[PDB]
Amino acid sequence: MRCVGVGNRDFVEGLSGATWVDVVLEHGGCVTTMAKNKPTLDIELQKTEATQLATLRKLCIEGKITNITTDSRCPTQGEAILPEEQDQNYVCKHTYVDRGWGNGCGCFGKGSLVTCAKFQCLESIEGKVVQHENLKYTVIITVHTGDQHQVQGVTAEITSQASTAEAILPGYGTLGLECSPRNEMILLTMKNKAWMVHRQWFFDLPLPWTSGATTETPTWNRRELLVTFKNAHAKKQEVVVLGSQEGAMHTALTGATEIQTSGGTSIFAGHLKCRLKMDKLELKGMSYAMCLNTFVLKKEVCETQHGTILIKVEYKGEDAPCKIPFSTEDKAHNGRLITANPVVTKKEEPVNIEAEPPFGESNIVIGIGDKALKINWYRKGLVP
Amino acid sequence: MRCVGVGNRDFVEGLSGATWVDVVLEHGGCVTTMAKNKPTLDIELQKTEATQLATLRKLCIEGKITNITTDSRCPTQGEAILPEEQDQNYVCKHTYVDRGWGNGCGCFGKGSLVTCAKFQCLESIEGKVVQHENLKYTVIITVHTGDQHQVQGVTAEITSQASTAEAILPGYGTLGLECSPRNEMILLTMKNKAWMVHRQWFFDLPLPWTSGATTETPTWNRRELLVTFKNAHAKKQEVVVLGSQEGAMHTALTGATEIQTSGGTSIFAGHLKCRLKMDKLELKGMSYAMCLNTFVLKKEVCETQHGTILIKVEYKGEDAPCKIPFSTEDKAHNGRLITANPVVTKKEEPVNIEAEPPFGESNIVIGIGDKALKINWYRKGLVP
Amino acid sequence: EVQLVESGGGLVQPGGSLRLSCSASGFTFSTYSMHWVRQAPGKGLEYVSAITGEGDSAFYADSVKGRFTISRDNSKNTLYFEMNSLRPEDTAVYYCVGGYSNFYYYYTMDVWGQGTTVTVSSASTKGPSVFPLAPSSKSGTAALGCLVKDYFPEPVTVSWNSGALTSGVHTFPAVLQSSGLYSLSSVVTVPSSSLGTQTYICNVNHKPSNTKVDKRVEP
Amino acid sequence: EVQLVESGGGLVQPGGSLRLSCSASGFTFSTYSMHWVRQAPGKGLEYVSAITGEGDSAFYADSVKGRFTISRDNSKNTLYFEMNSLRPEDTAVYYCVGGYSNFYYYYTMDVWGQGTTVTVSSASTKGPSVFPLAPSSKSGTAALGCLVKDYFPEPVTVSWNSGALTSGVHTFPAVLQSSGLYSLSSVVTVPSSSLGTQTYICNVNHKPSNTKVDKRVEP
Amino acid sequence: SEIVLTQSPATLSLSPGERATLSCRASQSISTFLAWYQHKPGQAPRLLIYDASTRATGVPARFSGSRSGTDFTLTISTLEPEDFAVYYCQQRYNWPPYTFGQGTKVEIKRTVAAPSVFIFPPSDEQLKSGTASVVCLLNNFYPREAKVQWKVDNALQSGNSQESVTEQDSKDSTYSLSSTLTLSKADYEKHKVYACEVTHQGLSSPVTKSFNRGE
Amino acid sequence: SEIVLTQSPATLSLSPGERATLSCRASQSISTFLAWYQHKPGQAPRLLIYDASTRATGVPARFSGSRSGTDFTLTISTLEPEDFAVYYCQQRYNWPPYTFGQGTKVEIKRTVAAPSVFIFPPSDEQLKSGTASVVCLLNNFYPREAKVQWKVDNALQSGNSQESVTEQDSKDSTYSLSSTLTLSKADYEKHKVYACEVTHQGLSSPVTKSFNRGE
Ligand SMILES: *[C@@H]1O[C@H](CO[C@@H]2O[C@@H](C)[C@@H](O)[C@@H](O)[C@@H]2O)[C@@H](O[C@@H]2O[C@H](CO)[C@@H](O[C@@H]3O[C@H](CO[C@H]4O[C@H](CO)[C@@H](O)[C@H](O)[C@@H]4O)[C@@H](O)[C@H](O)[C@@H]3O)[C@H](O)[C@H]2NC(C)=O)[C@H](O)[C@H]1NC(C)=O
Ligand SMILES: *[C@@H]1O[C@H](CO[C@@H]2O[C@@H](C)[C@@H](O)[C@@H](O)[C@@H]2O)[C@@H](O[C@@H]2O[C@H](CO)[C@@H](O[C@@H]3O[C@H](CO[C@H]4O[C@H](CO)[C@@H](O)[C@H](O)[C@@H]4O)[C@@H](O)[C@H](O)[C@@H]3O)[C@H](O)[C@H]2NC(C)=O)[C@H](O)[C@H]1NC(C)=O
């Protein structure tokens, strides 16, 4: 009884007297699954887990400039030059600076100057990509019982290579699961937190970038972006590094989906295609007889968001466990029970019954006899 | 001799035998000013100073949400409500949350929910506007002498109300200054630093804003921008505050002009229209006789960036102070001296002479006699 | 030329039934395989059913299996779609698509019917309530007009000043509210220079209810 | 109609002198006040001189005072601008602007001359060096053509394949280098499908030097 | 294991006469059995090309079909006014279902045009009836991406609004949108300030239109 | 104390048929003695209106003059193809100089179009002569705001470049730019990688075009 009254709920039913049923678990919602002469089961994707992700590119967000050197020449003698202009992880700009007798030169005019600084990254972020080969899904299967709560479920794991599993459902048998671990988006990881972002958006980030290789001395492409050169009055040229882009990134990531990371493991809302074989799932309480006493409802019958009605009834007879008589009417019609094979286990505890009534006016009668419970109901359908 | 060999240099000359001359000092460059039978003077705007600036708007960059309260109603009973929804400095959103028997409600469906948080600003920035009524210009006036250095100047202040000043130039008299303290741009001040930015750019900043009034309890317009509400799976709604925008602002201010602030005083590169009366400025050394010995140059004569030539000469005679003979030739022509009235003070110290030669080939002869100094020169003009 | 023309659309109550026909002309009908493609409001094409030239074998998509059944009268040159147990989700425009075939259902070039609409809803036919888009002051241009609410089924036609005022109007697509009823808005921008000069009247026309409503709008 | 036509432009060395004339037709010249407006390259209009209908009083802007002098021959229906001591800064297009006036210089509706160009420079006339815009591989579209460098004075005319190739060419505005010489570039984009098929030749034409240069361009 | 075709881009915004290329990517190889349909509203879809590159009889030679791997591309050489419509791919690989793509809309591209924003308070008549509908109108804006946010006094409204957009206008190639927010008059009259705040590319910062109840 | 007229905006980008309004603001009151001229290249400026609101004979009634305070506005009701040109204000307040404004360019507005970027290395002939000119070309882009940055191997080049932009193309209303960077061959051959990196609105992130010397 775990998915009544949830908006994100899917009904999938085994066609043509099937023994197997296809579900696509999309995290968040859950899938209620029925097959004929089988227990109805609520299935949902508890979490998706990823480990050992390949870094595709490293972007710097806080840099540092050191080892700064200058060289200037004079208005007659052409353009200044520094060997650091070809040394890597060095960012530089030429300007002209006013030259004359006072700063040392023979004649007057504008002379070449170039400032060169050694760039280094103090702290970086990574864009890691999600390998389908290290996803690990876990599915929770609870049986859509009438067991009491106003309204514990066994779980099974799915690796990409070990794609099959068996869920033991105590009292109902063994469900077999064969799911197929079936995204142009990157995990942007920054400082023990992570986001999921479009990847051309990531590749267009105005930040210095090296590749995913593990060398502790990488060359930073577009270093320039964290270094500003200022030659205001043609007397000097100053270089300074921009200071961390952590705040700017955070502001640019408000809309992004935040992702939990704790210890290399990261958790996703994933979508897993899958399907269930219930060949060794057969219902509880087919031995039991019909129920001879009367039934009365503990609450008002309630329509769920998907059109099914939920009914809580108390049985005040003494046949100890008994199958619950149930049908609908126009004019007899036999009802569509999502809580498959309702049975009263004990006269004190009430039971929940989820049923899909026909469209229009219908009469649900529970129990047997002529003072048995009758519930007038009218199901509307106005919007898809 | 303070503005030779500077690119940012302006030549303004007193027309029609004038005694007064109009200059527009734009910080950075300097203005060389000449009037007939007067000393040439180099004038520049040392700095512009502003104090007691009116804050026009306050923008929050780091906020805090406290006093958070929730209210929800149920699928049958309409929309939830909180009195804090009209209490000010409160930011709120409605959602729907799935309701049923398990969280407390009579029937099933989506029920109204609203979360309300009390917003408060932890740290803000100001957009202050520049009053022309509290600018304070200071001008440095140095006399365009030939006094020796390879190539101390008196300064004067200009308030907006006290718009006139007198600069004593020792040995040359008193210059009178009457300048007129003559911008759709705001001083963005953040955390003991400041920038100058376009003001619709400032007004469009996506940040919460109150007005300039000094009340310690202001109402923040567009608080929403620092608060995010998340209702992912329709089970709850969470509110959190964004954390400081200092980094984002800094990144958005790289192109802005940075402004020095230290103690409410802030320094600008300003533009001051002004003009100088030299009625009590008359030259040094008109008593002196012409110079009878020969002259020889210490260096090579050098063209400046504006077409004038700079000449360093040594005099090895004994007339102790003497006026320096000077003329140009096509064919005699009398020269245009920017260093007005050159005079040799002492036979050891050389003197500098700035002169504007005619276009084309010209011959500058210095001293008197026929073994006097003659300098062939050719002035080109190819670009404005 | 080769052409199919369909009929049989309309309003159905949920769980009800309707049959659609699609008659063929201009080709030997027996040699064409037939298919049913539907399109729900604000959605893409859905390929749902198919039948061979001889009607000896059918295919049903999972969405319609066991409720819709596709059939073919070759002598009468028509294609049939008997839809049973309609749910609100079946509201759509239904096209029948024909194509010459040597294999069971495979075809290359095709021909489509006009498309017929069916709407399944518990909603009962109801005329619309018409309320005014009251303007206010900007004295340049301001907007005003009519709001057409709680009507069923589609459509309504909204005219402005009995057609004299056409430039600047936007009649918006009907949105279908949670009540199962439709709601739309028809707006026009006009200069505030002439707010108190020209009376602006809208003509709402829900002919399924035959309610015609003129509403005058003013500040 | 009312019209003025000017003459007298050309090349002047710095410190040199030139006189511009601007002859008038279609109005009683004596009753028009005359003015000289100039426009330096890549700059706005500058109002520099003015003279009354009777030429009894002149006004000179500060930029031209004491070097340019404006005069008027009313009997010969012409206006004169004797420019002396030209500096490179005086390079411009000069318009003469006429207008009927009862007061000294004030006028309301006016008439402009065609505009004549004068260029002051130490630069000596020199033909252009022509170098190739060599293309490389993108096999869609690639760009190629000619570079016309170190010439004086303006202008050059650049044609592509003797005029057969016009679509897709951009001849750029000449930029005047620090040397006092001009430099421009003429480009065209064409498909790499036909890089080795059609020979691309440019025709550079600096007629002041009468140098005509055809340059063929290929990878 | 249905074959699913994924079309891209969702919306392709081009000026007339530009070259258009639309992609359809197949869940698995279908080898060449892919067809491109054009759908204009009011009409039935019209087969343009089939077997991935063969034109259907009578369609102009502008329409072009290409296939590499699972990726198919429909190319329009020069867009005509007629060609602005929606385009669907359909695979016919083995057996039904001959699934369709979700469509790509090809629209006329325009200079950015900021919307005119208007707000309309619930009418007295409808208020008498028992419900209240506030109506925010965005008039003649391009591009179509636009955000309407309803604000009640201090609260951001959610789940109580409905939008409707017109199709691109025949004369200025622009869009207009209408958002109506409906409340029970009961809830409507417990709140004072009703505003819609519009974010659009043509607006340097969002523009809000509000009213206070009853005035 | 010259009177100075300040025109705004510097560039006014409108589609044909749109309403255009150009402002000219006077250093001090000139009361009504303000005139609007239109300047198309190759021709002399043409007086459109004078005394701030009076049209000169023969100009269309599209052109409109308004004055409030020191702020004057020229208004074009519907822009014709002919009306894309530069506009100058001139004051005639008291006495010469009858100063001109600095002009407002009215241009055709277009959809954003990213540039085609090309780089051209110095030719062998010119290298023989003694200088080297690298040429970066930006082809058919709108808007005109575009940033060309020359990069030598690790160094950002400054002060050694010159740009030239064509006027808006008669057919696609677009611009093209050519930046040439000239060095003495001496300095040219001490460096290996020559690149121009272009920033433009049509580019999601700048595009660089480079070569290595001699290859
Ligand atoms: C780039 O700049 C660093 C200096 O770092 C700066 O420090 C501050 C104060 C600022 O000035 C910032 O600009 C920089 O952050 C140059 O020097 C390096 O760092 C220190 C000295 O500053 C050196 O550390 C030294 O190491 C000693 C160990 O003995 C020797 O061992 C090997 C044997 O070959 C030898 O290679 C090594 O260099 C040591 O000399 C030890 O006593 C103590 O730790 C001492 O500080 C460091 O080794 C320096 N690196 C060198 C010399 O390579 C960098 O040299 C400079 N980069 C250049 C010049 O390429
Ligand atoms: C908003 O929330 C604050 C609590 O602040 C939170 O603190 C942390 C732990 C988190 O929970 C965050 O959500 C917040 O930052 C409410 O309480 C106020 O703060 C403290 C208590 O938390 C109060 O300070 C008290 O003051 C005592 C002085 O005696 C009394 O003096 C006057 C006399 O009238 C009285 O008005 C005053 O309130 C004091 O009660 C002193 O012993 C000691 O400092 C003690 O902590 C503070 O006064 C609280 N403010 C009040 C009660 O107004 C706020 O109340 C809450 N805002 C609301 C409810 O509107």
Author numbering:
A (entry chain A), B (entry chain A): 1 to 151, 156 to 186, 192 to 339, 343 to 396
C (entry chain H), D (entry chain H): 1 to 52, 52A, 53 to 82, 82A, 82B, 82C, 83 to 100, 100A, ...
E (entry chain L), F (entry chain L): 0 to 95, 95A, 96 to 213
From the publication, what sentences describe this entry?
Because C8 shows similar docking axes, the implications are that its expanded neutralization range is due to the same mechanism.
The neutralizing antibodies induced during a DENV or ZIKV infection target the envelope (E) protein and, with a few exceptions, are serotype specific. The epitopes are distributed evenly at the surface of the icosahedral virion, which is composed of 90 E dimers organized in 30 “rafts” of three parallel E dimers (Kuhn et al., 2002).
